[PDB]
C-alpha cells in the first residue's frame, strides 16, 4: 500500500509535454484577450468623456448624456447576456469552480463573445464592477476551447487547461502572476476531493498571459501608493482590531449581496425585458455619478492612491463607503457581467483609511500613518467575504509593493477570516455556486 | 453532486480547538528557532574569540580552527548516530513521510537530538542551513503538543504537524509566505487528498514569525538593496539562465545521492568511523571558514557580496566548484542540517557569473550582473528540490525586489522544465523514496 507511494514519489511532477505546450497557448490567448478587453473598456469611457466635452454648456443636458450613454452601454450588455448566455451574468467565477467539479457547462462558443462584449458594455459604461470577473471566465473558456479544438483527451488536460485558463485571466487582470497561481490552489480547485491539476502548467500559462499584458501596458501601474512607512511591533494589535471589524462585516456583506439578488429578481420576475431595462437604469445611475461624485462610481482603482495618501476628509470617507456599498450591490446583485474583486479592494481601502485615521490621532505616540491601515484593509474584504486570504494577500502585495507591511497585512487578513467563520459567514463564491447547483436540482 | 452543495455550504469551518492549538505550536516553534539561532551564533562567536587568543603562530591557529570544528562536528554526528538516526540529513523528507503516515514522529528523541545535533554542525560552520533543523524540529513540536493534549482524529494529526513544519520554515528565513507555500506546494501528500486546515497553518506561521521578529528585527538576513529592472528585450536571457540551472539541477541530485552511497562505504554504518569522518569533514570547514571564508559557512554572508558583483570572474568559478564540493560532503555525510540555505548561495553565484558574462556581451542591454544573481538565487531550489513556487516567494521575501518577479519566474520555470526533460526528480521525494524503499528492503 505504501508500496504504491514509493512508485508515485519517483514519478511526481512529470506532466506530459503536450499538456505543457498547450498551457503556453491558452496563456498567450488569455493574455492578448485581456489586453483587448482592457484597451476596449478604456476607449469606451474615453468616448463618453469626449461626449461630455461636446455638451460643455447646458447642465441638465450633460447629466442626461452622462446617464443615457451608460444606460445604453449597460442594456446592451444586460441584453447580450439574458439572450445568448445567462451564465456570463454575474462574476462568472463560481461557474468556473463548477466546471472544475464537472457540474457546469463550459459553453465557450456562447460565453467568449457574450462576456467579452457584455462586459465592455457594463465596464465601458463605468458601473461598479471589476475586470477580473470577465477576464477569468473568459480565460476558462479560452482554455476549454483550445482543449476541444485539439481533441486532447482525459481528466488531466481537461482540468489543467481549464485551470491555467482561469489563472492567466486573473494575472492579466491585476498584473499579478503570483496572485494567479495562488488563486487556483487556494480557491478555484475542488475543495473536497483530490484533483489531477498540473501546477507547472498553470505557471507556463500565467507567464505567457503576463508577458502579453506587459508587452502592451508597461511603464504605468494600476495602483501606485509609493513606499509607505513601517509597522513597529507595538502597533500590531491595531490590525487585529481592524481584522475583527472586517470579519464581523464580511458576512453581513455576503447576506446583502445574496438578498439583493433575490430582492432584485422580484422587480423583473426573470423577464428578459424588465431586466435589461432595470439594467439600463442602474448602469444609467452610474454614468451620472461617474460625473457627480466620481468616487461613488467606477472600478475603484482610481481612488485607491487618493484615499491612501489620506487626502479625504473623514466625512467624505464615510460617504464614499455607504455610497459604495449601495453602488457595488446594485451592480453585482443585478447580475450584470463583471467581477466583484476590484470593488472589494476599493471598499476595504476606504474602511482601512478611516480606521487608520481614527487610530492616527488616538495614538500620537505610535507615529501612525493612516496609509498603512489602508494597505492592510485593501485585501480584507477579500478575506472576510470571498474567504480566501492567501490569494488576496499575495494580490495586495503585488499591486501596492509594500513588502514591509506583510505582517500587518496577514494579521488583518487572518483576523477577518477567523471572525467571519465565527459569525457564521461562508465563502461568497462557493455560496453562489451552491445556490446555482441547488437551484438546478430544484426543478425535479 | 448532491453532496457538493452540502460541503460548499460547510467549507472553511476548521474546529476552534484545532485553531487554538496551531497558535501554540506556532509560538513554540517560533521561540525554539530563535533559540537554535542565538545558539549557533554564540558558537561561531566563541570560535572567533578563540582564534584571537592564538593570534601569533600560524599552524597553531589552523589547528585550533580545524579542531573545535571537528569537535563540534562529531558531537553532533555522534548525538544523531546514537539517540535518533532520522535527525541526520535535512529532516525535511521525514516530515513528508510523517504526513503520509509512513515514518514516525519520534519527538522525545528528535527534539533534543536535532536541536543539539545542529548547534554542533552549524556552530562549527559546516555548509548546511538552519531550515533542516528548524523544519523538522517544528514538526516534532507539532506532534508533541498534539500528543500532550490527546487531540484525536486525522485532521488535527495532519494540521498540527503541518503548521509546525511551516512555522519553522518561516522563522528560518523570516519568510511567512514561503512557509505556508512550502506546505501546499511540496510537503502535503502529493497524490491523495488530505484534510489539512490552511487557516491554521497561517496562525502558526504568524506566531512563529512574531517570535522571530520580537528578537531578530532591525537587521535582515539578506540585504541586496533596490536593484535595477528588466527591460522586456532582456527576458530571453533569464530563459537561457533557467535552462543552464535545469540541466545542472539533476546532475546535482545524482551527486548528492551518489555521495551518500560513496560516503557510506567509508564507515559501513559503523557509529565510530562515521562520527570520525564527520569530525574530519566538519574539521575541514572550520579550517576554510578562515582560509577562504567564501568556501565554508551557510551562504547568507556571500549573497550580498556576489550580488554587488564585487568578485573577480575566476573567484566566482573557484567559489562555485569549491562549494559543490563542500556542500556535498556536508549534506551527503548525513550531518543534521538543511540543504535550502546552501542551494541559495550556490544559485546566487552561478547567477552572478552568467550575469557577468551577459554584462559585457551586451553593452546595449545596460545589464546589472546583480539581477541574474537574484534570479539564480532560487533556481537550484527549483532544478533540484523542484518546487519553484515556494522558492520564488522565498527569494522575493528575502531580497525584496518585486520588480524582478518576471525574470525570476522565468529562470525558475525554465529550470523545472529543463530538469523534467533531462529526467531529474524532486530531490526530497527522491530521498524519502530511498528511505521508504530501504525500509521494506
Amino acid at each position: 500500500r505504501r508500496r504504491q507511494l514509493i512508485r508515485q514519489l519517483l514519478e511526481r511532477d512529470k506532466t506530459p509535454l503536450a499538456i505543457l505546450f498547450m498551457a503556453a497557448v491558452v496563456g498567450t490567448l488569455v493574455g492578448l484577450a485581456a489586453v483587448a478587453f482592457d484597451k476596449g473598456v478604456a476607449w469606451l469611457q474615453n468616448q463618453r468623456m469626449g461626449a461630455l466635452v461636446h455638451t460643455a454648456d447646458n447642465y441638465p443636458l450633460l447629466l442626461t448624456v452622462a446617464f443615457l450613454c451608460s444606460a445604453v452601454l449597460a442594456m446592451f450588455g444586460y441584453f447580450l447576456v439574458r439572450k445568448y448566455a445567462p451564465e456570463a451574468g454575474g462574476s462568472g467565477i463560481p461557474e468556473i469552480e463548477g466546471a472544475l467539479e464537472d457540474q457546469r457547462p463550459v459553453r465557450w462558443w456562447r460565453v467568449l463573445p457574450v462576456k467579452f462584449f457584455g462586459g465592455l458594455g457594463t465596464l465601458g459604461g463605468g458601473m461598479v464592477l471589476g475586470r477580473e470577473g470577465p477576464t477569468v471566465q473568459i480565460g476558462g473558456n479560452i482554455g476549454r476551447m483550445v482543449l476541444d479544438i485539439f481533441r486532447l483527451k482525459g481528466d488531466e488536460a481537461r482540468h489543467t487547461l481549464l485551470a491555467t485558463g482561469a489563472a492567466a485571466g486573473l494575472a492579466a487582470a491585476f498584473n499579478a502572476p503570483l496572485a494567479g497561481i495562488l488563486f487556483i490552489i487556494e480557491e478555484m480547485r475542488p475543495q473536497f476531493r483530490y484533483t489531477l491539476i498540473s501546477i507547472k502548467a498553470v505557471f507556463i500559462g500565467v507567464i505567457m498571459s503576463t508577458i502579453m499584458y506587459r508587452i502592451f501596458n508597461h511603464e504605468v501601474a494600476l495602483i501606485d501608493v509609493g513606499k509607505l512607512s513601517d509597522a513597529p511591533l507595538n502597533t500590531l494589535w491595531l490590525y487585529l482590531i481592524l481584522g475583527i471589524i472586517f470579519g464581523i462585516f464580511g458576512p453581513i456583506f455576503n447576506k446583502w449581496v445574496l438578498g439583493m439578488q433575490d430582492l432584485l429578481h422580484r422587480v423583473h420576475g426573470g423577464n428578459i425585458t424588465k431586466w435589461v431595462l432595470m439594467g439600463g437604469a442602474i448602469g444609467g445611475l452610474c454614468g451620472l455619478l461617474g460625473f457627480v461624485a466620481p468616487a461613488t462610481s467606477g472600478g475603484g482603482f482610481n481612488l485607491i492612491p487618493i484615499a491612501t495618501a489620506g487626502n479625504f476628509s473623514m466625512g467624505m470617507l464615510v460617504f464614499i463607503f455607504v455610497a459604495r456599498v449601495i453602488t457595488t450591490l446594485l451592480c453585482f446583485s443585478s447580475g450584470a457581467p463583471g467581477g466583484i474583486f476590484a470593488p472589494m479592494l476599493a471598499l476595504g481601502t476606504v474602511l482601512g483609511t478611516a480606521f487608520g485615521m481614527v487610530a492616527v490621532e488616538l495614538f500620537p505616540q505610535y507615529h501612525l500613518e493612516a496609509g498603512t491601515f489602508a494597505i492592510a484593509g485593501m485585501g480584507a474584504l477579500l478575506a472576510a467575504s470571498i474567504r480566501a486570504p492567501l490569494t488576496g494577500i499575495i494580490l495586495v502585495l503585488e499591486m501596492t509593493d509594500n513588502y514591509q507591511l506583510i505582517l500587518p497585512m496577514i494579521i488583518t487578513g487572518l483576523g477577518a477570516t477567523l471572525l467571519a467563520q465565527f459569525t457564521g459567514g461562508k465563502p461568497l463564491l462557493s455560496a453562489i455556486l451552491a445556490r446555482t447547483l441547488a437551484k438546478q436540482e430544484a426543478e425535479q | 453532486r448532491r453532496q457538493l452543495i452540502r460541503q460548499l455550504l460547510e467549507r472553511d469551518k476548521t474546529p476552534l480547538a484545532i485553531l487554538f492549538m496551531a497558535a501554540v505550536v506556532g509560538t513554540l516553534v517560533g521561540l525554539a528557532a530563535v533559540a537554535f539561532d542565538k545558539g549557533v551564533a554564540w558558537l561561531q562567536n566563541q570560535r572567533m574569540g578563540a582564534l584571537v587568543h592564538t593570534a601569533d603562530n600560524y599552524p597553531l591557529l589552523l589547528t585550533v580552527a580545524f579542531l573545535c570544528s571537528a569537535v563540534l562536528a562529531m558531537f553532533g554526528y555522534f548525538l544523531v548516530r546514537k539517540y535518533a538516526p532520522e535527525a541526520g540529513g535535512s529532516g525535511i523528507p521525514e516530515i513528508e513521510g510523517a504526513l503520509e503516515d509512513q515514518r514516525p514522529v519520534r519527538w522525545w528523541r528528535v527534539l533534543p537530538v536535532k536541536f543539539f545535533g545542529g548547534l554542533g554542525t552549524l556552530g562549527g560552520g559546516m555548509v548546511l542551513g538552519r531550515e533542516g533543523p528548524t523544519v523538522q524540529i517544528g514538526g516534532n513540536i507539532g506532534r508533541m503538543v498534539l500528543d500532550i493534549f490527546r487531540l484525536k482524529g486525522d485532521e488535527a494529526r495532519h494540521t498540527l504537524l503541518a503548521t509546525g513544519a511551516a512555522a519553522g520554515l518561516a522563522a528560518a528565513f523570516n519568510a511567512p509566505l514561503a512557509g505556508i507555500l512550502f506546505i501546499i506546494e511540496e510537503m502535503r501528500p502529493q497524490f491523495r487528498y488530505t484534510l489539512i486546515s490552511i487557516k491554521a497553518v497561517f496562525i502558526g506561521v504568524i506566531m512563529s514569525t512574531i517570535m522571530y521578529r520580537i528578537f531578530n528585527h532591525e537587521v535582515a538576513l539578506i540585504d541586496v538593496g533596490k536593484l535595477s529592472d528588466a527591460p522586456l528585450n532582456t527576458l530571453w536571457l533569464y530563459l537561457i539562465l533557467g535552462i543552464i540551472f535545469g540541466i545542472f539541477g539533476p546532475i546535482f541530485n545524482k551527486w548528492v545521492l551518489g555521495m551518500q552511497d560513496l560516503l557510506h562505504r567509508v564507515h559501513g554504518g559503523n557509529i565510530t568511523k562515521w562520527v570520525l569522518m564527520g569530525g574530519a569533514i566538519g574539521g575541514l570547514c572550520g579550517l576554510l571558514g578562515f582560509v577562504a571564508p567564501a568556501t565554508s559557512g551557510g551562504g547568507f554572508n556571500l549573497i550580498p557580496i556576489a550580488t554587488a558583483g564585487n568578485f573577480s570572474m575566476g573567484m566566482l568559478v573557484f567559489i562555485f566548484v569549491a562549494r559543490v564540493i563542500t556542500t556535498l560532503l556536508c549534506f551527503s555525510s548525513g550531518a543534521p542540517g538543511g540543504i535550502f540555505a546552501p542551494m541559495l548561495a550556490l544559485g546566487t553565484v552561478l547567477g552572478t557569473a552568467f550575469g557577468m558574462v551577459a554584462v559585457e556581451l551586451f553593452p546595449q542591454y545596460h545589464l546589472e550582473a546583480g539581477t541574474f544573481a537574484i534570479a539564480g538565487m532560487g533556481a537550484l531550489l527549483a532544478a533540484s528540490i523542484r518546487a519553484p513556487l515556494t522558492g520564488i516567494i522565498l527569494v522575493l521575501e528575502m531580497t525584496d525586489n518585486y520588480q524582478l518577479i518576471l525574470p525570476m519566474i522565468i529562470t525558475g520555470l525554465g529550470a523545472t522544465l529543463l530538469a523534467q526533460f533531462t529526467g531529474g526528480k524532486p530531490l526530497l521525494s527522491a530521498i524519502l523514496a530511498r528511505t521508504l524503499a530501504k525500509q521494506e528492503a
Partner: antibody
Amino acid sequence: VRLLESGGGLVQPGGSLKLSCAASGFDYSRYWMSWVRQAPGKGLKWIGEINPVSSTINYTPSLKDKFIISRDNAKDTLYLQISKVRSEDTALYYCARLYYGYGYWYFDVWGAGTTVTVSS
Amino acid sequence: DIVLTQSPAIMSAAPGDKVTMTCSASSSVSYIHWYQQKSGTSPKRWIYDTSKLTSGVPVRFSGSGSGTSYSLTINTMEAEDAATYYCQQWSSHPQTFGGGTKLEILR
C-alpha cells in the same frame, strides 16, 4: 550620519529667529525629525516633531503660535521658528532623528546644539 | 503629562562599584530610554527599551525595572562613566524627560 544645527544667537526680547539644522549621511526622509531644548542647567523639554513629508507636525503643550516646525526635504534641512521671544526661550537647541526598536520611540541621533540668548 | 523623577539628583562613587539611579514615573509607563551627556557634549542614547544596550555601549551597563520604577546600573563603574544620565519615556504623548542624575567620580 551628522546633524549640524546653526543660526542661534542674540535675540531682542519680543522679536524672533529661525534655527536651521543641516543633515548629511543618511536618507533624510523615512525619518521623523524633532527639536529639543535645554535651558542652561535644567531639564530636557521637547519642542515638537515633524514626520517625513510634513503631513504630521506635533508640538508641546504651549501657546497658540509659539513654534513653527518645518522641513525642506530636498535641501535636507529641518527648521524651527520661535516667535515673540521671552527669556524662557534662552536655551541650547538640539535636533534629533527619531527611531524605535519595539516602537516606543526614542531620540536616535542628536547634533551639537546652538545657543539662543534672549536679551536686550 | 507624565513626569519622571530622577533618583539621586547628584551622586558620587569610587571607580569599581555597582551604581544605580532611578526613574520614578508619576503614573504608569513602559519601555523607558536612557541618555548620556558629558560636559559640553551632545547627549548619546545609552539604553533603549528598558534594557537593550545601544550598540557601542560597554557591557558593564544594564538598566531595567517596570511598572512605576526603573533603574540604570553600571557594573563596575569607570573613568569614562562620569556623565549625566537622563531617562526618557514615550509610552504616552507627549513624551518627557527626567530631572537628570549627575554621576561624579569619587577619589
